[PDB]
Write a protein that binds this ligand. Sequence first.
Ligand SMILES: [Zn+2]
Length: 121
Amino acid sequence: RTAYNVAFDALKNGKYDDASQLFLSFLELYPNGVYTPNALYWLGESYYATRNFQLAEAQFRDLVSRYPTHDKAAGGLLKLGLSQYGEGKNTEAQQTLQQVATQYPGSDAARVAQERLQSIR
Ligand SMILES: [Zn+2]
């Protein structure tokens, strides 16, 4: 049990403010560790959960940029687009959701991105 687990447990319990502080703290210590991509993703999700779309955008963008082949990257790009939609940036959001199907064809994330894209229209 380490700092990642302490952060993850706050998230599991729906304590999003605590989880954001703890994952932010984790990322200060681990700018490029084994669980860095995971932490960027979950920090993004913590922010997304509380409609902090600008804060979420930074985390998901970083994740996809730096770890494009990581397990979390497809979902990260999906949530980047959803965060941009949350910011009211419809053009940029549609572009990003389109990117999920292009860069991560066949992924669960690509499917969801297409569903959300059709709803945005
Ligand atoms: Zn934006």
